[PDB]
Amino acid sequence: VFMNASQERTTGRQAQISNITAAKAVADVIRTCLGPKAMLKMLLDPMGGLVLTNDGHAILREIDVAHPAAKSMLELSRTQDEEVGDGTTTVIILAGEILAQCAPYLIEKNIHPVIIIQALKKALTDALEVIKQVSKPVDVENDAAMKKLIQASIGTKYVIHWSEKMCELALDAVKTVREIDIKRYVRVEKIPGGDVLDSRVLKGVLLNKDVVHPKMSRHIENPRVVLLDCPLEYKKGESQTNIEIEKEEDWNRILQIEEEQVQLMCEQILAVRPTLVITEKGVSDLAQHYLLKGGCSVLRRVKKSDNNRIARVTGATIVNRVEDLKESDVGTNCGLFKVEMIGDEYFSFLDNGSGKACTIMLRGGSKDILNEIDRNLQDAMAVARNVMLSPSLSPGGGATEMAVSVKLAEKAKQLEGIQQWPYQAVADAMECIPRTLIQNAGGDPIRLLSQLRAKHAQGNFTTGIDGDKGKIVDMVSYGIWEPEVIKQQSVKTAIESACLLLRVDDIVSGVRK
Amino acid sequence: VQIFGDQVTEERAENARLSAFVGAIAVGDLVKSTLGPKGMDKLLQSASSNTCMVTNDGATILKSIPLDNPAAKVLVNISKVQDDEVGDGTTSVTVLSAELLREA
Amino acid sequence: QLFNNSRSDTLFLGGEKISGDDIRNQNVLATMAVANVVKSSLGPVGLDKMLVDDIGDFTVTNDGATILSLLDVQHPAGKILVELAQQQDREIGDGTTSVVIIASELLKRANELVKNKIHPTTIITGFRVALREAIRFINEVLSTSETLINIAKTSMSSKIIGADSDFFSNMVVDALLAVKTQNSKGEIKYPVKAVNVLKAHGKSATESLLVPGYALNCTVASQAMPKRIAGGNVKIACLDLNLQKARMAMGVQINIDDPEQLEQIRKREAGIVLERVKKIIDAGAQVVLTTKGIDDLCLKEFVEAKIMGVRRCKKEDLRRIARATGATLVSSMSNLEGEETFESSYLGLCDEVVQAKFSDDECILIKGTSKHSSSSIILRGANDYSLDEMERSLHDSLSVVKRTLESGNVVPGGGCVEAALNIYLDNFATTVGSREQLAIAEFAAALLIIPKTLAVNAAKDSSELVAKLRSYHAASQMAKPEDRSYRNYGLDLIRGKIVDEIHAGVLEPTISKVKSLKSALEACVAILRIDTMITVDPE
Amino acid sequence: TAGLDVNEVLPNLYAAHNTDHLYKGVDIDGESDEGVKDIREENI
Amino acid sequence: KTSRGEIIISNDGHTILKQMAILHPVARMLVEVSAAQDSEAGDGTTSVVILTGALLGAAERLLNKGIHPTIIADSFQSAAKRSVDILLEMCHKVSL
Amino acid sequence: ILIVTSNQKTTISNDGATILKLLDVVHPAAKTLVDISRAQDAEVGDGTTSVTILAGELMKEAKPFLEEGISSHLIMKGYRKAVSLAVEKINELAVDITSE
Amino acid sequence: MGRPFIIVKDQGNKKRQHGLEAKKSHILAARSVASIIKTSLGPRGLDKILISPDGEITITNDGATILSQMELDNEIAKLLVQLSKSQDDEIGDGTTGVVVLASALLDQALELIQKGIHPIKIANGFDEAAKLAISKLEETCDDISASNDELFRDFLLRAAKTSLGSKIVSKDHDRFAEMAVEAVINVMDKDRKDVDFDLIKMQGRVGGSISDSKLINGVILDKDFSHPQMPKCVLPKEGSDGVKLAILTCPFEPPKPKTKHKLDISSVEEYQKLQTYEQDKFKEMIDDVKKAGADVVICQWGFDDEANHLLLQNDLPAVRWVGGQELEHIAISTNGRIVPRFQDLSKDKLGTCSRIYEQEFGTTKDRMLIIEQSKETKTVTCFVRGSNKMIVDEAERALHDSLCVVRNLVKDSRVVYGGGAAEVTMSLAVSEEADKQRGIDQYAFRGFAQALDTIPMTLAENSGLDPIGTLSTLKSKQLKEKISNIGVDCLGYGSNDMKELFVVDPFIGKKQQILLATQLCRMILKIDNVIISGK
Numbered sequence A: 001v002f003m004n005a006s007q008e009r010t011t012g013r014q015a016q017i018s019n020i021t022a023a024k025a026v027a028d029v030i031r032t033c034l035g036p037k038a039m040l041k042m043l044l045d046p047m048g049g050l051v052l053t054n055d056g057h058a059i060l061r062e063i064d065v066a067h068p069a070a071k072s073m074l075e076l077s078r079t080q081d082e083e084v085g086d087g088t089t090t091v092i093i094l095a096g097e098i099l100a101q102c103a104p105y106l107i108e109k110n111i112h113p114v115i116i117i118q119a120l121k122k123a124l125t126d127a128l129e130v131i132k133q134v135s136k137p138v139d140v141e142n143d144a145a146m147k148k149l150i151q152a153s154i155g156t157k158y159v160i161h162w163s164e165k166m167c168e169l170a171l172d173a174v175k176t177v178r179e180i181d182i183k184r185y186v187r188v189e190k191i192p193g194g195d196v197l198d199s200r201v202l203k204g205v206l207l208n209k210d211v212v213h214p215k216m217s218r219h220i221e222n223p224r225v226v227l228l229d230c231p232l233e234y235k236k237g238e239s240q241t242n243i244e245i246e247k248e249e250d251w252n253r254i255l256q257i258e259e260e261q262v263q264l265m266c267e268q269i270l271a272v273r274p275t276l277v278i279t280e281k282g283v284s285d286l287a288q289h290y291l292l293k294g295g296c297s298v299l300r301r302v303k304k305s306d307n308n309r310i311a312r313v314t315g316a317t318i319v320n321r322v323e324d325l326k327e328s329d330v331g332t333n334c335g336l337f338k339v340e341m342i343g344d345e346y347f348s349f350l351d352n353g354s355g356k357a358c359t360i361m362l363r364g365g366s367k368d369i370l371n372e373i374d375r376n377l378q379d380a381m382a383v384a385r386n387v388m389l390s391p392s393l394s395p396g397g398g399a400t401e402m403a404v405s406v407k408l409a410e411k412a413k414q415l416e417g418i419q420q421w422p423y424q425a426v427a428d429a430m431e432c433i434p435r436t437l438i439q440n441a442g443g444d445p446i447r448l449l450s451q452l453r454a455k456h457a458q459g460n461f462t463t464g465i466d467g468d469k470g471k472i473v474d475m476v477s478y479g480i481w482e483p484e485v486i487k488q489q490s491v492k493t494a495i496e497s498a499c500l501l502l503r504v505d506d507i508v509s510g511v512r513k
Numbered sequence B: 001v002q003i004f005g006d007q008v009t010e011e012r013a014e015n016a017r018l019s020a021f022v023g024a025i026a027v028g029d030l031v032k033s034t035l036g037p038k039g040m041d042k043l044l045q046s047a048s049s050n051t052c053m054v055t056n057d058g059a060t061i062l063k064s065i066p067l068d069n070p071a072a073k074v075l076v077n078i079s080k081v082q083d084d085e086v087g088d089g090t091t092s093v094t095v096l097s098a099e100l101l102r103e104a
Numbered sequence C: 001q002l003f004n005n006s007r008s009d010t011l012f013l014g015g016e017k018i019s020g021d022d023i024r025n026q027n028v029l030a031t032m033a034v035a036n037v038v039k040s041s042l043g044p045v046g047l048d049k050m051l052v053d054d055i056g057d058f059t060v061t062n063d064g065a066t067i068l069s070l071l072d073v074q075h076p077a078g079k080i081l082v083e084l085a086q087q088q089d090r091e092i093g094d095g096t097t098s099v100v101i102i103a104s105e106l107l108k109r110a111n112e113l114v115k116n117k118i119h120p121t122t123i124i125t126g127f128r129v130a131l132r133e134a135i136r137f138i139n140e141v142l143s144t145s146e147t148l149i150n151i152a153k154t155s156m157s158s159k160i161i162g163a164d165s166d167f168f169s170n171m172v173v174d175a176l177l178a179v180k181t182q183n184s185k186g187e188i189k190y191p192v193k194a195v196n197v198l199k200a201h202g203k204s205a206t207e208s209l210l211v212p213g214y215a216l217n218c219t220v221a222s223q224a225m226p227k228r229i230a231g232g233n234v235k236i237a238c239l240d241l242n243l244q245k246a247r248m249a250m251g252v253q254i255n256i257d258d259p260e261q262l263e264q265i266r267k268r269e270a271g272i273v274l275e276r277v278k279k280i281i282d283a284g285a286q287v288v289l290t291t292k293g294i295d296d297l298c299l300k301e302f303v304e305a306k307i308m309g310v311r312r313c314k315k316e317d318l319r320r321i322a323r324a325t326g327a328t329l330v331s332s333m334s335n336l337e338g339e340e341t342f343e344s345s346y347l348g349l350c351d352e353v354v355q356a357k358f359s360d361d362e363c364i365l366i367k368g369t370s371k372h373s374s375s376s377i378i379l380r381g382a383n384d385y386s387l388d389e390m391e392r393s394l395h396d397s398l399s400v401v402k403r404t405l406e407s408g409n410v411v412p413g414g415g416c417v418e419a420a421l422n423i424y425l426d427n428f429a430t431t432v433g434s435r436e437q438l439a440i441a442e443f444a445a446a447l448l449i450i451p452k453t454l455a456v457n458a459a460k461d462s463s464e465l466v467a468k469l470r471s472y473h474a475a476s477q478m479a480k481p482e483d484r485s486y487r488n489y490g491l492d493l494i495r496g497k498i499v500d501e502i503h504a505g506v507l508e509p510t511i512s513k514v515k516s517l518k519s520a521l522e523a524c525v526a527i528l529r530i531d532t533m534i535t536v537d538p539e
Numbered sequence D: 001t002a003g004l005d006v007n008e009v010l011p012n013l014y015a016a017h018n019t020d021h022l023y024k025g026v027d028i029d030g031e032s033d034e035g036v037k038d039i040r041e042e043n044i
Numbered sequence E: 001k002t003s004r005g006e007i008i009i010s011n012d013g014h015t016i017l018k019q020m021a022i023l024h025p026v027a028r029m030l031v032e033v034s035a036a037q038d039s040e041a042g043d044g045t046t047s048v049v050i051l052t053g054a055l056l057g058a059a060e061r062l063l064n065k066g067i068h069p070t071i072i073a074d075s076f077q078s079a080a081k082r083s084v085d086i087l088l089e090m091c092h093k094v095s096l
Numbered sequence F: 001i002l003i004v005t006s007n008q009k010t011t012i013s014n015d016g017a018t019i020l021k022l023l024d025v026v027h028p029a030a031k032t033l034v035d036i037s038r039a040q041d042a043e044v045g046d047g048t049t050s051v052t053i054l055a056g057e058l059m060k061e062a063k064p065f066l067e068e069g070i071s072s073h074l075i076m077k078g079y080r081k082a083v084s085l086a087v088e089k090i091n092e093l094a095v096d097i098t099s100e
Numbered sequence G: 001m002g003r004p005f006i007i008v009k010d011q012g013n014k015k016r017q018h019g020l021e022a023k024k025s026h027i028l029a030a031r032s033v034a035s036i037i038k039t040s041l042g043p044r045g046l047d048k049i050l051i052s053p054d055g056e057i058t059i060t061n062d063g064a065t066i067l068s069q070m071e072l073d074n075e076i077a078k079l080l081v082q083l084s085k086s087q088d089d090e091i092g093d094g095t096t097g098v099v100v101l102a103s104a105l106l107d108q109a110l111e112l113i114q115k116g117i118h119p120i121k122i123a124n125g126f127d128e129a130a131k132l133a134i135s136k137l138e139e140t141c142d143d144i145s146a147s148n149d150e151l152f153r154d155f156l157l158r159a160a161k162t163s164l165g166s167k168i169v170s171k172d173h174d175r176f177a178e179m180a181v182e183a184v185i186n187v188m189d190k191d192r193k194d195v196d197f198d199l200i201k202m203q204g205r206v207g208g209s210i211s212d213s214k215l216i217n218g219v220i221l222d223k224d225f226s227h228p229q230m231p232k233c234v235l236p237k238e239g240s241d242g243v244k245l246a247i248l249t250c251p252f253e254p255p256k257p258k259t260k261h262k263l264d265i266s267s268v269e270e271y272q273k274l275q276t277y278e279q280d281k282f283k284e285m286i287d288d289v290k291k292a293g294a295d296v297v298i299c300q301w302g303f304d305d306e307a308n309h310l311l312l313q314n315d316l317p318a319v320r321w322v323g324g325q326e327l328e329h330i331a332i333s334t335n336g337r338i339v340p341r342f343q344d345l346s347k348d349k350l351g352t353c354s355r356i357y358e359q360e361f362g363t364t365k366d367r368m369l370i371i372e373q374s375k376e377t378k379t380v381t382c383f384v385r386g387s388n389k390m391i392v393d394e395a396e397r398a399l400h401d402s403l404c405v406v407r408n409l410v411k412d413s414r415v416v417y418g419g420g421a422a423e424v425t426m427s428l429a430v431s432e433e434a435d436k437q438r439g440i441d442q443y444a445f446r447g448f449a450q451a452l453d454t455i456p457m458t459l460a461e462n463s464g465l466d467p468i469g470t471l472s473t474l475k476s477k478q479l480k481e482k483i484s485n486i487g488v489d490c491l492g493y494g495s496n497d498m499k500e501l502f503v504v505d506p507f508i509g510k511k512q513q514i515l516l517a518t519q520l521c522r523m524i525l526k527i528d529n530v531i532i533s534g535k
Ligand SMILES: Nc1ncnc2c1ncn2[C@@H]1O[C@H](COP(=O)(O)OP(=O)(O)O)[C@@H](O)[C@H]1O
Pocket: A033, A034, A035, A036, A038, A054, A055, A056, A086, A087, A088, A089, A090, A091, A152, A155, A156, A396, A397, A398, A437, A465, A466, A467, A468, A480, A482
């Protein structure tokens, strides 16, 4: 052998085409999932589940892609979700028509890639300054002005029907985790049936465990709470202890030490005047007797992550060592403990001071369509958390994108030379969002892009498309405004993308290691 | 360095003499019992036809049985020759033919 | 090139042999095979490749040695150039692609002298002569030197971050210039990879923020611990021993004979740890960084004491935090007497210990070290393929800066070190004479491959630049003492005209061209000495 | 096919074509690397 | 290239012979002679083999000419005795 | 050269056209060298070997220019005149032997 | 820069022997071929027993035969088969030594090539050396042209004697030789000095001993007499001194035309006129012969049943169905002429014989027709007999070799002396001029002569004497004396004098047995690039 054989080399313009081809035909599978008139691409996963949504990244995420340029494209909607939450659809459509409007028109006119990258790198530094100057800063704590945010960002996927409730559930979830937040202290326990109008953010945590002993109370008024990082049975010697019995009596004395060890725990647990005791590990069948006589309803084996969630609500701190259980570690101001029964299965609630973790109870019409709502609420809770960090808002609905078009269409003419061709094709690219927004609506794109581009030049930044109508609309008067970081990152990575794939001129296949 | 084609056999001097002798002596030692008054007959049988023959005529034995050993096939012919040129002495020819080569 | 016949006299097993001309050629063909893959990837106008794992999983890069590493090479005399390609990346850091293409043309040309009639011993003596003269010439055409911002930026172009070269220029320079250290009682070298590089997929490429401290890719082990501690003079405990419960030391067994000792012995398995935890808390430690484990038992002790404490962190990281904050690594603390004590002076002083949220991932930052400057780079960008390469593109660019700082000499690159050697050596060819002449002559012209392919890769014509470049370098040998005033050198490829690469700012390090050729020779020498190959089949 | 600056020939060819303009069309070689040729004179 | 996989590039003759895969038992005897020269001198492992190849070629022609190999062998070893004597008389000593 | 053809036909020769014909050249670009030698046997008889030799070495010494960014159109526009000048060199060099 | 390519067609099935390591594999190939035969040279030679793919047995000494049978594969060996095959045609004898010399020459070349010498210079060195050997032989060779009639007939026997003593025919080589000479005198036109081997027929019938192999002055047929009642002997009518033969090429059958035909008989009486034409057309055939005065009818095509009995009644012994070639031989031995149609038979176109007799060829087998003469006739049938199919064939193959050495002596009436002598003089003569050649060729000439010495050495070898001894006694006795006709006493008499010993080889024989070797040797040396396809 010379190299290794069984190696398909694609070189030159030949290799270039393969990348732009795939990257643009990636946008194609999601083009009809943009905006309001968008659809639901129902997906069959590998091992037998089902996913059917709009959430761009959740569609791609469940597609297997082989051609590296599309493997690079799909794993690029991942960066977007892992930063903002919404805009995972947009990113890929731009990533495509930056490579589409830009590349073939000008790579097949002999222009060298490395000039194009420098040309498209300037078009971003320019594009970001445009978005930030066409946006308007917003009051993050005008509780009702922030609901207009969320109202707009859910007005896309099947959840619209009940936006009013969802925004209250989204905004009230982020309100009680704010010093700045992390939306993973927010368990979203999905419970099938009822209807959405039954969903209620609980300032607290919900558990699927029942009280370990029948006699223990299923209703405590104001429970003092202890949280445990340790099992409630006798531990063994971590030093491989073994017992060698000689005398007759020896047996009972030891076999009670374990009976006593638990009573030494229970005496130490109960010594903090508790009424509730929750453990990460399992609870003994003798531990329940001494905690019944202690008057404490006990909960066993509860998720490690659910403990940090509870300890944040109740205010108590979790301790591994029973020996050193202090006065601080008890649940001051948890207003209630109940075990209500939601048709067959027992759930334990913890309701009512200073919260910093929260449980979203969701109700729908199936365990299947519930997930598709959670996919909408996660995209809702995201647009609310963005804004509290980056207080500014872009005027969306194609308007922010068209703004970047004629600002870059002016800058290109004023640049001239050779660097102009690639630069005048990011301006070409931006209009693709309006273009698909007219399309998904169903109006004539050319007729409406015309009355959009020119009606933007001397007609304000906030001039975009109304989804359901398919007409030009001043987005100030309408109420579609997308958070500023979405428009920022969307344009950021989508170009960072097109400028990674352009550097490719050669594809060597069959590499190994 | 091989010279000939495949499935070709080269029995040289030392080994060629072995074939020559072993072949003749084998044929001689086959008809030895045919010779003489108180001599005995052979029962030849072909695989083809299901036919046979109970014979003494040394030629009829040798002319019948198949053989590979060239040195043997030589004495086989000299047996036919004798049957052609005299009619009798088929066995005598072959035995004396072999015994000379045995003594060689 | 008809497949050869196995001899009818010799008898070799699971092995055949090709001799004289058949081998010499097969070596050059396989050498060109390896070299020609990565010629496209040479120069600022050079491009990048996409290397499919076979599962579809891939890596995109320029860095020659990583491309060569990745290609499955089957021939001995291919893997030799690949073994050199990396021997480059461990002795210079950059120039990996160049050194391979030089070695190839040295072989190729050397062979075309043997494929004429000239003996290999003549040529190998004729390569020895040229190299002795080229390095002597390089040192007499080196410039000993602001300047670091160029040497960085020269290793930026040809790779992805060359479009944002100026940023990733001052990144590289400051990052390194802030880990200066002395060894062996005076050696002032800048540590080979002390700048801990992390890459997270988010934000923009320009928004990759240098850390004025150190980047740990770990989190505050317990969620109830403070995810920040700020203000001047913060105390950090760099640990190495685990904080868990022990199995009876080692050779220790348990025979319980008096039942009451069950709980006595079991409880004391907690103590030893809780006692070592206490000797840490009570030392005035606010932040703990332990290489080995932390028990849930010993977390609840940090939690309540508001000690932000990490577990299972790379010891490679912790020693560079030991050398930077003031701290000393604690393998295990036993005094002059047997007693296990922990003095407060063991800890490192810093500014802040902040766990910072980057694109769906939190990690701890040790801000503002006191005992010595420390620097870390957190890259940001499109996806993982994007980040991967710009980390490898940094490792190449941080490298060329290191060797500048380690060796007080730079060369005017841009292929003018090469171009100048072409005509100097070609003119030196007459000084010897005979058959040894064509050898040096082929060597002098075998250096053309760098300046040639740089301009091929631009798609446009090469010879226009190439030969007109030679004339300018042929204008330095007929140039008088005072009349210098004729001396100039360099090449530009974006605009495509000959430019002064010292004034332009194109700078490759001194060693990067010496240990470049030095190796390239002992490559083709070994291959040219090959006249018979004997390949024996697996066990 | 001639290996000339596509981006530098086409603008130089259009410019010279805006009645002696009617004859101007592209040519091969180094002097014509400047641009075009008067096609009326080369018998083309 | 080793049976095992390792690449070996050499000029040392014993190192060359040991690592190629010689199959013919009599040919393998040659490796032993080349090994024995290394274990008596470390140099001349190439010289010693070529000599056997030209001495054997000698022996061949003599066998062509019909000389009993026992005589050849003994007189070839009588050729050794007289030759090593010559080298011992022709050599110029060295100050140690 | 001793060539044994696919049909057991054993031939020995020095005649270039005969060697290149008995060699089955499949490569379509290397079939030019068989037709280049065949034409020499048709018009002359001798040279058959030399023509191919010349042909190859022209393509061989054109590789170093092609390795650099040079158009093949310009290379052969320089060979086309060179041969037309090589013929002019011979015509003035050819000795009319009836005279001397 | 690596593409898996297709230059030549079916490239995967083409192996290439290259440079020196190829030449070794070529010479050693010829070497092995030589070792097979070298033991079969001279009167002390031994025979090779080859078997055909079908299973037919051959036992021979004729070198050409030996090599012709063996299924060979190595291209150099294949070439040597044709080398011996060549000699047999050009001469008939020598086929054995031709190959030995060629291999020894190729050996000598191998020894010199490993000394770093260009092979084309060696081949050119050989040919200039071969042209010096043949010149010394032409200068020294003895001549039978200046002889009387009594001595010429003796030298031809001496050559026959030499050619035969080597093969199992050696038993009766007094008889066998005296056949080979008798055959050539009879058949070759003196002034044309040209002998046709289409004139001498080889016939072989198995039976009795090789002693019983006679030469018959006429022809022997595998045909009987047409009618069983006909007599065996045919005696010449007293006053004629000959038998007379009706040699015919027409059937004793009612004449029928060549072009397609048919009758169209309507009248019954006209079918009767046809019926009485059948019998009459027959009687007009027998009267036609009886009136020509012939005693025996020999005809090419077959006799009709009615025509056979009327051939008996009128005392006309007949030979049904005679071969085309065989009729030609009858008409030439009997002096007669060949007669197309009955109308053309005349008492002048009759064949004169001394006897015609149906011999009981076998004791039980079949009868044969011998047409003999007491006078010398242009065709002569050579009837070989033996005790075995394999002896018969080899005896025929021994006569044909013996017959050839006499045919060569009629063409070139000059002789040289064998037993190595001829090879020795050449070796000596080339040897002395090697020092006078000098330069590069000094080794090539030395080679040529030294390789020649293998012929006498391998004679002395097979015969059981020391190779160096016989060589150093022989080459030396050919310098101390002026004589160049000193050889080896392979049989084992006191002298080395090949003259007095009657070991005689023709001249052209020896010369061709050198030129063919050196020329082919040049061809192998010229080869260095080898390309072999697949099977
Ligand atoms: N009712 C509407 N009419 C027109 N444009 C809209 C409307 N709602 C949202 N948009 C625009 O479309 C985008 C939302 O579309 P969506 O399918 O959610 O894409 P993504 O998942 O990328 O956010 C917003 O960024 C906004 O600019």
